[PDB]
Each structure stands twice: as C-alpha cells, then as structure tokens.
Amino acid sequence: AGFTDYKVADITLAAWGRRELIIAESEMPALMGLRRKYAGQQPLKGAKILGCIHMTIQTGVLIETLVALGAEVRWSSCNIFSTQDQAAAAIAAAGIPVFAWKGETEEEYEWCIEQTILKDGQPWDANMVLDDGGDLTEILHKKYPQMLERIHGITEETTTGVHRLLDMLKNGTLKVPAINVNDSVTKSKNDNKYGCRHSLNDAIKRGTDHLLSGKQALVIGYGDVGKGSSQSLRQEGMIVKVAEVDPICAMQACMDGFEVVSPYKNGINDGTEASIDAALLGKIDLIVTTTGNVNVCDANMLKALKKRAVVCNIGHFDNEIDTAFMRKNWAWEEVKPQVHKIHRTGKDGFDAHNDDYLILLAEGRLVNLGNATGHPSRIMDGSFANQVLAQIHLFEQKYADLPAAEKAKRLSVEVLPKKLDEEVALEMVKGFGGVVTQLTPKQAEYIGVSVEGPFKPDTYRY
Amino acid sequence: GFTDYKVADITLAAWGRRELIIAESEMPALMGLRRKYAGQQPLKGAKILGCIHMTIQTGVLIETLVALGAEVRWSSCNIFSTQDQAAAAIAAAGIPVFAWKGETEEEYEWCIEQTILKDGQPWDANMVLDDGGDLTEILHKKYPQMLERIHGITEETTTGVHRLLDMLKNGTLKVPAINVNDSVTKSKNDNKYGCRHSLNDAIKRGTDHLLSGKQALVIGYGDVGKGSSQSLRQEGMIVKVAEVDPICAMQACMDGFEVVSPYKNGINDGTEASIDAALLGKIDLIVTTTGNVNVCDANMLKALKKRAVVCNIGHFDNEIDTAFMRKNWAWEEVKPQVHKIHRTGKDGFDAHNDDYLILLAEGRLVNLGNATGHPSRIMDGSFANQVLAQIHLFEQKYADLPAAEKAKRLSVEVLPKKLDEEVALEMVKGFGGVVTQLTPKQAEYIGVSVEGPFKPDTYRY
Amino acid sequence: GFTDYKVADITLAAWGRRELIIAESEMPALMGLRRKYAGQQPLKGAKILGCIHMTIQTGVLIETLVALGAEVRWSSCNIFSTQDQAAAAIAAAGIPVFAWKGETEEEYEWCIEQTILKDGQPWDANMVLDDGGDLTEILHKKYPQMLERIHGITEETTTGVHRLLDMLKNGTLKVPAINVNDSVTKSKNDNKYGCRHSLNDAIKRGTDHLLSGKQALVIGYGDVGKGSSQSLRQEGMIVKVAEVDPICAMQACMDGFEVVSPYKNGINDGTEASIDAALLGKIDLIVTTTGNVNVCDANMLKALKKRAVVCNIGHFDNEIDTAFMRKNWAWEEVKPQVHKIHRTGKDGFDAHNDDYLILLAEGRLVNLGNATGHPSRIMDGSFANQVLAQIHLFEQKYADLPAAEKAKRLSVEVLPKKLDEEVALEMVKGFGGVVTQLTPKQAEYIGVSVEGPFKPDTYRY
Amino acid sequence: AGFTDYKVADITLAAWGRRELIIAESEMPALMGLRRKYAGQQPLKGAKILGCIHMTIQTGVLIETLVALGAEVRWSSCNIFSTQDQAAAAIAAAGIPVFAWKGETEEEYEWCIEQTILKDGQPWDANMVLDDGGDLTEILHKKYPQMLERIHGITEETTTGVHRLLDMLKNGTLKVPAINVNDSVTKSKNDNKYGCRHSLNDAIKRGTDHLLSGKQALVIGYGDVGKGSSQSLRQEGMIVKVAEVDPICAMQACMDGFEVVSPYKNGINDGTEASIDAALLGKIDLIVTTTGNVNVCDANMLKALKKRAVVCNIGHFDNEIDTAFMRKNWAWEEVKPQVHKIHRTGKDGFDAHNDDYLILLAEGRLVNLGNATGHPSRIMDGSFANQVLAQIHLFEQKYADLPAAEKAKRLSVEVLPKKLDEEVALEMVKGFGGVVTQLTPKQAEYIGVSVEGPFKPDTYRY
Ligand SMILES: NC(=O)c1ccc[n+]([C@@H]2O[C@H](COP(=O)([O-])OP(=O)(O)OC[C@H]3O[C@@H](n4cnc5c(N)ncnc54)[C@H](O)[C@@H]3O)[C@@H](O)[C@H]2O)c1
Ligand SMILES: NC(=O)c1ccc[n+]([C@@H]2O[C@H](COP(=O)([O-])OP(=O)(O)OC[C@H]3O[C@@H](n4cnc5c(N)ncnc54)[C@H](O)[C@@H]3O)[C@@H](O)[C@H]2O)c1
Ligand SMILES: NC(=O)c1ccc[n+]([C@@H]2O[C@H](COP(=O)([O-])OP(=O)(O)OC[C@H]3O[C@@H](n4cnc5c(N)ncnc54)[C@H](O)[C@@H]3O)[C@@H](O)[C@H]2O)c1
Ligand SMILES: NC(=O)c1ccc[n+]([C@@H]2O[C@H](COP(=O)([O-])OP(=O)(O)OC[C@H]3O[C@@H](n4cnc5c(N)ncnc54)[C@H](O)[C@@H]3O)[C@@H](O)[C@H]2O)c1
Ligand SMILES: Nc1ncnc2[nH]cnc12
Ligand SMILES: Nc1ncnc2[nH]cnc12
Ligand SMILES: [K+]
Ligand SMILES: [K+]
Ligand SMILES: [K+]
Ligand SMILES: [K+]
C-alpha cells in the first residue's frame, strides 16, 4: 500500500524475480535450513542492517532470510553492473528498501549507498552492517562516524574487503568489530574457487560466444580466485598459462599442470616497453586478472597483446587493468552492453573493419557478475549461511552497548568457529545427496576428536 | 673394511649410485641447500638417528645431511618401502644403514635398534628424523636416557605429528619437534600430488589392471584422499568418496565425486545389517587414506564385489582389518606384495576359485610397497624442509638449556612461511617457471615486502 | 525500397553487423573461400533455397555464398534457433530472410514457403541447402515441379542425411545430394566439440544451476552424445550414459562413464514396472542426443527426481514425450524457453509446489534454443564444407542432363578427403598451429603424396 | 618331461605365469566367451597356426583360446623386448611350442621365428598365420614361399602390418588372403588409443620414476596411438604439444586442447640444423613418437633437445628415432635394462657426473611393452576376440583348398563384419557391468536398423 522507499530499474520484473527466488530457495539448503531453524526464536528481532552486496537472486534469498529472522534492512549493490534487475524488483515488491540496478554510473552508485544510510533525509538508526568489498564500511567511517557509535558489527564477504578492515585495525581506525566471512572454508574454498570455475567461462561465452578450446589464455594470479578461473578455462580446452608473485601458489600451478610465466622478461617490471615479453603476449588470446592488486594488466601489456585478444577482470575492483590508459588513448566501440572493442589505432574514431582491437568485458569490472549472473545459488548457499550466522553472533554480542573500556577488548576481526563451518558444509553435502559417515566411539578416540566434531585442528588448510 | 650396515645385496650399489645422480638433477631445492650450506657445515657435531623409507629420494636427503657435517645411522620406517639399490649405495658410501625390502616385523625392530645402538651401547645421538613416529616411540619407551642428549625431532608425516601432539598434551614429550608435514611445500605437495603420481602407479605394477570404466571407493578426502581420488579419476575410474568430515565431503562434491558411506545412513552398528551391500557389491577397488583404524572392516570385506582390489595408502595397515582375513580366509601369493584372499574358507583354496579379493602389500603403504613411492621432484620439497628443520633444532641446542628455558621451548612447531616460500621458489625454477616480482607500489598496495612473505599465516592456499 | 523479408526487429541490424564482423575474424576457412573464389564467381547464376538456423554464423555463410555470385532466400530450420540481430543484419543487406526467435509451428511453415515463392509464384531456384530435411521434404512433396530445375541438395545434419538415404532407397529422391555432415571437419567438429561448448552454456543461461557434483543421464553416445557428456563431465557432473549400440557404449566405458539403461535388463516394455526407479530418482539432469523417437518417455518422466532438468539436443523434439506432459501436467513459464512442469495435475498448480520438472526450449534443440548454438570458430568447418558442396554440385549441372544420365548421376555422397583436409588446415592455422611437411623419403615410406590425402578413405580418425 | 620343443628364459617361472593367466581370464570376458561358446564345435580342429606377436600374459590367453578351439600353434614374439618371461614359461609348460624371451638380440629374434616355421629341421605343415607387424608374413613370402601353398590366410594385428599387406596386394605379391584385425572398432579405437593411454605413462614411470606433472612433452603424431599417448601424459598434468603432418588429426588436437607445433621452422624439414626450432626443442622434457613413419625424431632434433630429456617411441618399429646416429656419435650409459643415458659429449667414455645427456627408453623399441607390460588384459580382450573370430573365418573358408578361379575371387584384405564387431563390444560392456538398452520395434524402424543390429552403416566413424 503506497510503498515507495526504493529505486530499481523496472518494478514489473518482480513476478519474474519471485519465480527465480522460489527456484533458488530449493538450491540453497543451508540458508533455508537456517530460516526454518531460527524463525521461531527471531534472533534478529531489533536488528537494523545496512547491506551492500551484489543485488542478485542469491542476495535476495539472503535478504529474505535475514528479514524472516526478524531484521529490518536497507540494501544496495556493491558493483555498478552486478545487479539482476528482476531480483531487485522482487525485493522492492516485498516492501524492502532496495536501491540497485544493472548499469549504474559511479554517481548513481554512491547515491544508492547513501539511500540506505539515510531515511527521509536523516541517518537511519542502523545497528549492523553487511558488506562486500568495504565501500559501505568506508563511507560510514569517513562520512557518518556518529552512526557507527550505535552499530554492533560488520560482517564482510570478500578478500579485498577483509584486507581493508585489517588495515583499519592495524591503524587504530576501525570503530566496530567485524567477522571475516570470507575465510570460512565453506566460503573461501567454495565461493572464491568453485564459484569462479562455474561463472568465468559462463561470462566469456555470453559476452563473446568465442570458442575457448585450443586457444591461449594467461591468468594473472593463482589464489583461490585464480585457481577456479584457471580451472574454468582449462576444462574448456584452453592452453592456460599462469602468472604469480607468490612462489607457493606458483608451485601449486606447476603441480596442477600449468606453465608458470611472467608478462615481464625475467619477471622484472621496470615500467618500460622493453621489459614486456612481446613474444609471449603476442600469442595470448585471453587474459584474466584475479589478484586483488593494482595494475597487474598494465598499459605496456595491453599494447603488446595479440590482436583481438579478450581482456577481463574477476577480482573485486577494476583497477587491476589499466583501463584509464585505454580511455585516454584508444577508441571504444560498444558491441553490446558490457562488451567493448578497443581500437589501438588511435583516439579519434575508428575504422569499422579495423583488425587491431581488443575486446574488453564489463569495462574491467567483475566479469562473472557483469556479463553473466555470478556464482550459482548452490555455491552462494555456503557463503550466505555464514553471513547469517555472523550477523546473529555480532548482533547478540551487542558491542555498541558496552562501556568504552569493554569495547576495547572486543574490537577485533574474527572468523566463525570451525564447528559452524562444518555444520554449513554438512547441509551442502546433503543437498547433493551425499552421505557423511559417522565415526564409531573407538575411531573418534583413535584420532582424538569428538564424534560430532570438530574433526580438524584450527591449523588445518584443507 | 666397513661393515656397519645390513642390506639385501651390496652389489646393487653401482645401480643405486646411477639413480642417485639422476635424482639429484630432479631435486633442485634439496641440492640447492646442499650447495648453500656446505661451507658453513651447520650440522657438524650433529648425530642423527633417521627412520624413513630407504628410497633413492631418502638417499639424496641422507647424503645432504652428511655433506652439511652430520653423522647418521639409518633405517626404513616400513617393511616394504626400501629400494634395495638405494640401501646398497648408501652402505657402500660408508654410512650405517639397516634396511631391505621385505623385512619381517621382528627384522624391522632389529633394524631400528641397530641405529640406536653402536657396538652394543647407546649411540651418542643428539638429533632424530622420523616418519610415522616409530623411532620416536621406541626412544621414549625403551631408551629414555638417550633423550637427555637429543636436541629435537623433525617428523615427516601426518600420523607422526598426531602422535607428537598426543605426547605433548599428555606431558610425555621429552624434546621439541618440528612438524615438517604442515609446510605447504610438504602437505599440499607430497601428501596430495605425490599420491596422485604413485597410487595408480602401484596398482598397475601389482595387477596390471585396466582402471578406466571401473568403480572405485576412496575412504577419506584429506590431502592423501584428494590426491588418491585424482590418481584414479584421471585414469577414467568412476570414483566415489567416503568421509566423516563434512567440509572435506563438500570439497569432494564440488570436485565432481559422489559422496557415499559404506554404512546405511552412515551409521556403523558393527552388524552386517548396517552394511550397504548393494553399494559395496559394485566396487572394483577400495583405497583407504585416513590415518584412522578399521575404516575397511570385516563386514565391508565380506560384502565387496568378487575380485575387487583392496589397498591402503595411509601410514599404518590397521586401516584394513587384515587380521580378520588372516584368521578366516586362505591367502594365495601371486607374487611379492600381491595376494589373492580366497573367501571360501581357511583350509586351502581352489586354484580356479572366483570368490577372492586381491590385497596389495599386505595392507601396508601401497605406493611404496608395490612401486617406488613419490617421485624425486616431489620429495624435493619435503626433504628440503627436513634439512631446514634439522638445522633449526640442532642450532637451538635444547638439550643444553637450563630447565626454565627448556620449558619455554618444549613444543611442536612448523617452519616459518618465509622458508616455505624459498623452498617453493626453487621448485618452481626447476620446472622452468618464472615468478613475477612486485613493484614497490604493488607491494605497498597489498601490504607485503617485495621479498615476501606474501600471505598471512592464516592463509590456506 | 527493399521489403522482401520478415524478421522480429529490423533496427537490430547494426548490432547484427557488429557481431558479423567479429564472426568473420573467427572463421578463417570460410573467409579464405571468399578470397580464393571471389574473382572467379563460381556461384554466378546459382539461386539457393536455404533452410538452417538463422544465427550469426549462418549470416557469414550466407554472405559468402552471395560474395561468390549466388542469390539466396533463407529461413531457419527451428522455431527457437534464430538470433534476431543476425536476421536483421541479413535483411538490411537486401537478402530475403524469413525467420525470428519464437516462431509458432504455423509461422515456421509460412517462413519456408516465403523462400519457395516469390511474388506468389515458385521461385526459379536451382540449388538447395538444408539442415534436417524439412525444406527437402516440402519440395519433394508439395512442389515437385521445382526439383526439375534444381541441380542438388547439400544437407547439414545427421537426421537430414537419414531422410535423404530413405528417399534414395525408395527411388523417390529427385536430385543428387552432398552429405555435408560426414566430412570429418563437420561431424567430428560440429557434432562433438560444438555440443561440448554449447550444452552446458545453454543450461547455465536457462537455469543458472550449479552442475558440479550433480547426477546426469545422457541418452546416446554418438557424436552429439560424446560431446554432450564431455560438456557435463568437464563441469564436475557425475555422468551416466545410455546406448543401444554396444560399440558406442564400449567407448563410453573407456571414456570413464558408467553405462546404464532406464529400464530393467534394458528391456523397454512400456510399463512402469520396467523403469529403474532408484536410478531415475537420483538423476538431476537428463539430456537426449539420439536422433531417435521417445527416448525420454512418459514413465521415465514420472520417475525422475523432483526438480530435475529435462532437455534435448537432438534435431527434433520428439526425443522427449512432451505431448504427454502437455496433456497431463501444468506448465509454468519461468522465462522464455524455460518452463516448470508441475506433476500435480493439469488444472492449475501451486506456486510453491516442490514436485516439478524444468524443461528447456520446450524440448527443442537446447543449445540453439537457450543459448547461441555452436561458436563461430567451430561452425567455420561446417560452413566451409557447405560452400564447397554448393560449388561441387552446381558446377555439375545435374538438372541439364537427360533422364538416362540423371539416373547414373543420382547419389548421396561426401566431399573428397582432399577438400576435408584443406578445410582442416585453415582451421589449424587459425589456432596458430603449424603442420609439419613430410620429406620425400617419409612420404614414400607411408605411401602418400607430400600434399595428401594422408589417410585411406576407410580411416575413422 | 619329454617335451622339449620350446626356448624360454626360465621355465621355473611357469607357476607364476599360470597364476597371472588365471587372473587375466577374469579380465577378458569377450575372449573367454568365445572359448566357452565354440569349445564344443572345435571350429579350429586341424588348424596349424604360426603366431608372431608379443609373448605377454594377454597373448597367453589368446594362445590357449586357439588351442581350446582345436588348433595347434608354434609361437614367437614380434619384438625383442616385449615378452613377459613368466607368460612364455607358462605356455611352454603347457606343452605349446614357444620361442621367446625378454632381451633377445636381433639374431635370436630371427632364430625364434625360424623355429616356429621349422619343426625337426623341415617346414612345419602350417595352414594359418597370426601376425603383428608383418615380420613373419614377410619371411614366409621371401624365404619359404612354398609353405604359403598350404596356408588359408593371415590375421594381422597392427597398423604397420596392415600397411605392408596392402602394398603386397597392390603389387600382386600377397599369396594368401588376410583379415585386417586392426581396423575393427573394438581393436583400433580401443587397443591403439585407450591401450596407449594406460601403458605410456606406466612405462615412463617404471623406467625413470620421473614426475610428469608440470613438465613439457612433445608427441609426434596424433593418429590413434598419438591420441591415446597425448591423453596419457596430459591426464598426468604434463603440458603436451602435438606435431602432425595430417591437418585433420591436427584439427582434432587443437579442439582437444593441445598446442600444435612443428620441430622445424614453418614445418619445413630440409635436413639442415638451421631448420630446427631450437627454442622449442630446448624446452622439451619428453618426446614420444607415435607415427609408424621413419626418422620423425631425427639427428638434428636429438642435438637440440633440452638436457636430460626423455626420448621414447611407441610406434611399432624403432626407426622412428635416429638411434643409429646416437650409436655412432655418443656414449651410452646403461642405467638399468632398457634405460640408457646418452651422453652428447662424445662417443668414447663419459663423465659419470655429466649433465648433457638424454634418457632413451627400450633403445627406441615399443616403450609400453619394453619398459612395462603393454596394454592391460581387459583392453586386449577386444583385440584378441577379433583375432579368434578372424582365425575361425579364414580357416573355415579354406582358401588353399579352393579351385583357382575361386582363389582369385577371395585373394583380398578384408575386415570383419560390423555385426561381430558389435558382439565383441557387448561382452566388453557387460564386463564393466554396463547395460545396453534394447530398441523397441518402433524405434528400430524409425532409425532404419534391426533390433539386433548392426546399428550403424559401414561408413560410420564413431
Ligand atoms: N568475482 C568473484 O566472484 C569474486 C569472488 C571472490 C573474490 N573475488 C575477489 O578476487 C580477488 C582475489 O581474491 P582471492 O580470494 O583469490 O585472493 P588471494 O589472496 O587468495 O589470491 C590473489 C593472488 O594474487 C596474487 N598476486 C598479487 N599480485 C600479483 C601480481 N602482480 N601478479 C601476479 N599475481 C599476483 C597473490 O600472490 C595471490 O596469490 C579479490 O579482489 C577478491 O575480493 C572475486
Ligand atoms: N603413502 C604416502 O605416500 C603418504 C604420504 C603422506 C601421508 N600419508 C599418510 O596418509 C594418512 C592420511 O594423511 P593426510 O595428510 O591425508 O591426513 P588428513 O587429516 O588430511 O586426511 C585424513 C582424512 O581421513 C578422514 N577420515 C577419518 N576417519 C574416516 C572414516 N572412518 N571414514 C572416512 N574418512 C575418514 C578425515 O576426516 C580426514 O579428512 C596418514 O596416515 C598419513 O601419515 C601417506
Ligand atoms: N544440436 C546440435 O548442435 C546438433 C549438432 C549436430 C547434430 N545434431 C543432431 O543430433 C542427433 C544426433 O546426431 P549424431 O551425429 O550424434 O548421430 P549419431 O548416429 O552419431 O548418434 C546417435 C546415437 O544415439 C544412439 N541411440 C539411438 N537410439 C537410442 C536409444 N533408444 N537409447 C539410447 N541411445 C540411442 C545410437 O546408437 C547412436 O549412437 C541428430 O538428430 C543430429 O541431427 C544436433
Ligand atoms: N605400442 C603399441 O601398443 C601400439 C599399438 C597399436 C599400434 N601401434 C603402432 O603405432 C603406430 C601408429 O599406429 P596408429 O594406429 O596410431 O596409426 P595412425 O595412422 O592412426 O597414426 C599415425 C599418425 O602419424 C602421423 N605422422 C606420420 N608421419 C608424421 C611425421 N613426420 N610427423 C608427425 N606426424 C606424422 C600421421 O599423419 C598419422 O595421423 C603404428 O606403427 C602401429 O602399428 C603401437
Ligand atoms: N551470485 C552472487 N550473488 C552475490 N554475490 C556474489 N558474488 C559472486 N557471485 C555472487
Ligand atoms: N599386452 C599386450 N599383449 C600383446 N600384444 C600387445 N600389444 C599391445 N599390448 C599388448
Ligand atoms: K547466479
Ligand atoms: K620414487
Ligand atoms: K554462436
Ligand atoms: K599387460
């Protein structure tokens, strides 16, 4: 009845979104089990959550779980291209404030986040934060510090965001405790790796429809994202080469059957065109950045790439690729939304039949979400079940209600306990129809664990 | 006139030396340490008791320790894992070694004793290198006085670490230890990729069975289980995985394996009624990888498909209830370390009976028992860590410290990540890989030194 | 003032052209034919009726035929396979095209007729290019007099070749045909690797389902079934395979798949009792690849696991008993070409019902229906064969022969291996591959010319 | 006792060979199915078969199937390194003439074949031939042409052998008809491909125990043997490159995810050191030849290969590699049997710690049989069921007893009917527990086949 506290592309997409949410719920048994387990107790009654994460169908199931458990929320996306407009519409049609659409400008992106922070032109009385990448966290600390006085905690989704939290902690500028949701095993080693395996080749196919088999790829980075991305491309038949600065991750790449190369001669990046391995890059049909670092696909690399190579980024921020250089020097031809040919023949105009161009996906933004739908529901199930458990834990601790001196001992960045990590994993396994074996009492004693777990020491790397 | 050894055949020494020279070219991290530390002689004065599979790879480790100044006395940590040409060549170099392929249990104990004792009295050892904890246990239980002079233990494998931690928790650990297993250049190299190379290797040498198109069940999905599953799936087996750890089970699913339990609903009640007989009746090959007890039990063995292969790649053979098979069924040796177990009864067998199982290596570590274990280029990473761990604890001189200082240092620790990275770097250069160097701005951006360490200690890789 | 077409939206032409320019750079064999033959205009005077999926790739084929001198009039061979931006770009270039995504059956027939008729009278066509045989059937059945002026037919796909051979068997085929399907650079490229690329693509676009760790059933293991199985296995699915051909089933076993039948003892007696209910109750995804009829039947659909995905990648939708589902179950459209089928009955459904199946493209070709079919660099091979096939038959002028000569010339043949190899070499070069040249001595050693053909006609690759 | 008509390395190995034969019988259901189906009718009663094929355990089961169906045989191996001494001992212990052992010289190889041809110093009354590679066939035509007057046919196992038969037929020199067993689908696309997949990495591990993951391989050829060999290495994690002269096979290698390269610049082999791609070969850790051609790993390639590379051949004959050049110029150091280090520092003497060497396996002979045990029983089941069917067919045809005008009509090289190819496959599939579905009558009519098969036209390539 007259609900207007939202901003989306097209509200008439709600029915479509609701049909896909109903499907996603059946693909998300950990999250839906939390919804059924905690609905009666209402553990988030009184929670007012500021949320900033890609407004996908999967985020929708997260949002409605939080609400089902008693929370009120205000939501935005954490990327200008990652929203699914039918998902945003369905959330708005349910009476939940949401400000998100695919294809936002940077100005519109900032406006959307501020519409969650401000209700009727004044600070909302928020008391919790859910974030993916740290942009909302940064705005609260820099622009709305007084609002953090009443906030009990932050649950942070992704590697880059965790890094920004830890910098604030070391510098003494973090105002509230956080849970690092990224480093649950059912998050980092599920979402970060297997998610990109599913969705990297997905986005490249939808953007270009290029055959990948038999072609040459260079993947920059071999962390969790680089591992899944490399697998995404190798399993399609690409000849994949991997770059790394971390020798242990490079050792893994070698043992996984990849050739380890550097874009720079002897791996020495002195900033000149001369240090580029021109012969290597002139053979590369596809380069993918996965690092969370800055300028790992730089201007000289872009100048040396094989004609018509595809360039994309699947790390959190677009500065992994020197796109600024390309805007300033080369002419952009839009093929379709989030697909651009970049003509290296000059800046003023281009020949429509020019052969010397590069194809950039999503303007260098997260490519799995920009050109496809990101990770699949059954994978995000694990990530968003951790999110819900982390919101419950920090809300229940009530950090904001301690005295100055009690906050001081509680101000940290923590992960969830392994027992809960395992309980999330068990529901995911059951979702596949898997059957976990149960230790006998003598077997539990033999290896020194409790029959119900946890089954590994906190040092275990899986 | 050197005679302080016992091996199968000293005339194999020339063959062993030829393979050691090749293996040196496959082990650049370990050999890089040998060249790096030869001048300093950091192990001069060290007297190391060593108990680890007497392979060609262990041979390269041994000579590196000696080149760095150590004296050693050596035995194998398994009755079937020795390569007799490796043993012969080490003995022919004047290094005390007591090991041969095919030891009895009695002979296995004698071999360890012969390193502990020299000329009838306890050797003046001051260091221990162990794989599985058998030597560590014999020292604590039968020779406690010798631990008064020992500076530490460097332990190779998951099971051995578990035994250390249990001793520490119980106040019975007498000296400090380094957990060599949990270096990333060990656990996530040796344990996983080593078994990937050597599991299917050992099954082929033992049976020459085709694997593509057949059904396997891998019990466990830790590091060894992950690598063993891959060893079989890459050959084209249809692989199912069992686990008690739901996180490891999650990894198996996402890796494309069906996760199942030998027991209905995963509940083992000790009766035949709880066995999933339909599942096991379809399994051509079962591999145990757990470090646990009786994970392929008698009821499972009674239910396996006729002619299935049974093997264990965990450290100890009690993963399989072989004792039950010895008591109730008739064993027919096909050839060394390959037996048909005839389920028709105890007293003799029909040579053309079709109701048998094939057991490899009598349930002992099958990659080392029926083949040669992990390849040189993989063991390179494990044994470089071993050398760095021996240097660190020998230089700490725990045995000489006053009691209060001992109490500060009586623990089980891992090597620093910086050293893990330097090992990995030489491994990568061995493949011809080129690591990229961060620029100052890039190192500042992610908050690391250009030289590393590149990850926090929490990182799981 | 060009109006001789009908497409969804002419304003999509500019986008269509941008994707065509990219496709040209992905199709070197095809574009190579443009350059080699353009000066000689071998298709001058050719008037080609074309019926094949109106994709971007088909657009490059069309413009190659035109660049070599032909006139054409085109329709799609499937109601869902058209890319509307490709048909718009062809129309805007002045070429008669009648095709859009989401045709009805009536509209499908109307579109084909618009190519046969120009200004209400039969077009003066003298060549036919077909994919599935629908246009060929209509000509033989409804416009026989037109075949008196046609020099031949070039047929793209296995199902259409079968229908040509039935006519040749019966003596009702009026003009000769080239079987384009059985070129190696078609069958073992398009049929296999094409579905490998585009099956998991279409399933992801339609459902966004995770595939890793779930159970799939692929009916059939010919070229399409081989590629489809790989499309799913490489994603981490556990794939089971059904076959009626023991040789193809043997290959599935060796490729690492479990071969199963939907029916007990493999006997399909048409009763529920025949269905392996435990098997069907485990299956998350079933894909039909056979070119046969009712290989995913009513009893199988009734037994499928709740929320299973059902799709067909064979040419015709009768592989799946969708008529049963239309008559008995209620259909809920998720989005275009994605329907939930509620097994609770016909009279409505509960929006939160859990007992449903997901059908893609209403049982039509799923790679073209829910995605964009094969990628350009694969269709390069297929369509370079098409072009050469068209020249081959057109230059032979069957229609100008007397009846006695036609009888000797009537046939269904494949292109000579030499042309097959020439196409293949251009495909290899597009990957940057370098083929090695035989020395004279080596050529003589194996009994071939340095220029090929390199294999006898019996070779299977 | 009394029986002395054989020559093997060590007769005391018979009991061990018998045990492995009993195991292999359970791995070979197609072959043991033929044994049980035809034992009663004794279709080979009166046949006297000269056999020349690798004296492995799998060949033992073939030999005893022929005898069980009524034949007498005299047997030798078709390679100096491929015999399993325990299989040879078991056959001799069963009273079957066999002349074979591992590690024959070239002279002993010729002697062994001659011992099958001659019994008691005069030609045996042979009337059938089973061959693998055509050596025995060539000796009969050249040195014992009168014996062919009594012989009803030849069943030839392998690609090279079939090639030699077709050239004799084209020249009018083939004296008896033959069955090309190689080109059954249950042979060529099972044995030649999947057999090398199983046995190539097997042999390299037994010989060197080298890690293969992360290393660079060059496979020369991509026919059936090259396809299986490339997969054998790739599945281990090797970075595999493929060379071919046939562009269709090259196209398959690209689509299968391999980079297609040539050892020669632009693929032009002009016999000069300048034509070698030294940068490419200086990066190769392992080269495998699979072609059935001559000198495809030549002297100039050998000179350019990375130090300590492994060199082996899995084609039928050793002249795929220029071992003669290596014998003439470099010093060979035997590591152990069938494993030699080839020191490129000179011909006379070597430094025991020299680093500039190559590792050659099996002296360039068939490496899977030389350094391991060849194909596994369950694969050879297909090959050898075809051999039994082919022997029965040609023996029952009785070519040597036909009138001249009938002889002329039947003097050819043929394959078995597709119906028998399918029947062999069915028993293989059942051996895995596979279940083949039966067409309904309607379905059979729809695709134009009989419910019983054959299911494909003879043009079908699978
Ligand atoms: N798109 C997605 O769906 C998604 C999902 C999860 C994470 N991410 C983002 O992707 C990025 C990577 O996350 P992660 O979990 O993989 O982090 P990670 O720390 O596990 O891996 C990143 C790797 O990049 C390497 N690297 C850094 N600088 C390099 C350089 N100059 N050249 C080569 N390699 C270099 C590091 O050594 C490290 O191994 C982060 O921004 C993260 O937030 C994206
Ligand atoms: N053969 C070799 O070369 C080799 C090499 C390294 C380690 N190992 C040995 O292999 C064993 C495994 O070592 P790891 O590093 O993989 O240890 P790990 O802890 O990583 O893996 C063992 C796994 O077994 C699982 N498990 C335990 N009981 C089970 C049961 N009843 N059913 C199913 N799964 C069960 C545990 O959950 C765990 O994930 C140890 O004995 C180790 O010493 C052998
Ligand atoms: N969608 C595409 O992109 C595409 C591409 C090429 C061909 N096709 C079509 O796909 C179909 C298959 O083509 P193909 O080249 O693989 O033909 P094919 O003859 O090589 O394979 C079909 C297989 O199905 C098997 N089969 C038949 N009936 C069966 C049954 N009842 N149960 C199980 N298996 C059964 C046959 O044994 C045969 O091996 C044809 O309709 C063809 O036109 C589609
Ligand atoms: N070792 C085994 O167990 C085994 C098994 C079967 C066959 N073989 C033998 O292996 C050989 C290959 O048999 P196949 O069935 O694969 O034959 P094939 O005809 O199918 O393949 C041989 C390939 O080598 C290629 N080739 C020829 N000369 C070349 C050159 N100079 N450079 C690169 N490629 C070149 C050809 O184009 C061809 O594709 C034959 O000698 C055969 O008898 C061995
Ligand atoms: N589908 C998705 N929804 C939300 N966050 C994501 N991150 C990656 N994929 C995602
Ligand atoms: N094991 C084997 N026995 C006989 N011939 C073979 N050819 C290849 N492998 C073989
Ligand atoms: K998604
Ligand atoms: K080894
Ligand atoms: K396409
Ligand atoms: K064998």
PDB file of N, CA and C in Angstrom, chain D residues 104-112:
ATOM      1  N   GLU D 104      66.060 -60.371 -26.332  1.00  0.00           N
ATOM      2  CA  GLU D 104      66.710 -61.062 -27.443  1.00  0.00           C
ATOM      3  C   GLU D 104      67.626 -60.117 -28.215  1.00  0.00           C
ATOM      4  N   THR D 105      68.644 -60.684 -28.857  1.00  0.00           N
ATOM      5  CA  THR D 105      69.352 -59.936 -29.886  1.00  0.00           C
ATOM      6  C   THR D 105      68.588 -60.034 -31.207  1.00  0.00           C
ATOM      7  N   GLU D 106      69.001 -59.221 -32.183  1.00  0.00           N
ATOM      8  CA  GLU D 106      68.355 -59.285 -33.491  1.00  0.00           C
ATOM      9  C   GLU D 106      68.521 -60.664 -34.119  1.00  0.00           C
ATOM     10  N   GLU D 107      69.670 -61.308 -33.901  1.00  0.00           N
ATOM     11  CA  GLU D 107      69.878 -62.646 -34.450  1.00  0.00           C
ATOM     12  C   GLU D 107      68.957 -63.665 -33.784  1.00  0.00           C
ATOM     13  N   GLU D 108      68.851 -63.613 -32.456  1.00  0.00           N
ATOM     14  CA  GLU D 108      67.949 -64.511 -31.740  1.00  0.00           C
ATOM     15  C   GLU D 108      66.501 -64.279 -32.154  1.00  0.00           C
ATOM     16  N   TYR D 109      66.126 -63.020 -32.393  1.00  0.00           N
ATOM     17  CA  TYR D 109      64.781 -62.732 -32.882  1.00  0.00           C
ATOM     18  C   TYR D 109      64.497 -63.491 -34.175  1.00  0.00           C
ATOM     19  N   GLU D 110      65.435 -63.442 -35.126  1.00  0.00           N
ATOM     20  CA  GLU D 110      65.264 -64.168 -36.383  1.00  0.00           C
ATOM     21  C   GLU D 110      65.244 -65.671 -36.148  1.00  0.00           C
ATOM     22  N   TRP D 111      66.126 -66.152 -35.271  1.00  0.00           N
ATOM     23  CA  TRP D 111      66.157 -67.569 -34.937  1.00  0.00           C
ATOM     24  C   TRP D 111      64.812 -68.033 -34.388  1.00  0.00           C
ATOM     25  N   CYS D 112      64.201 -67.236 -33.503  1.00  0.00           N
ATOM     26  CA  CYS D 112      62.945 -67.630 -32.868  1.00  0.00           C
ATOM     27  C   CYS D 112      61.829 -67.807 -33.896  1.00  0.00           C
TER      28      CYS D 112
END
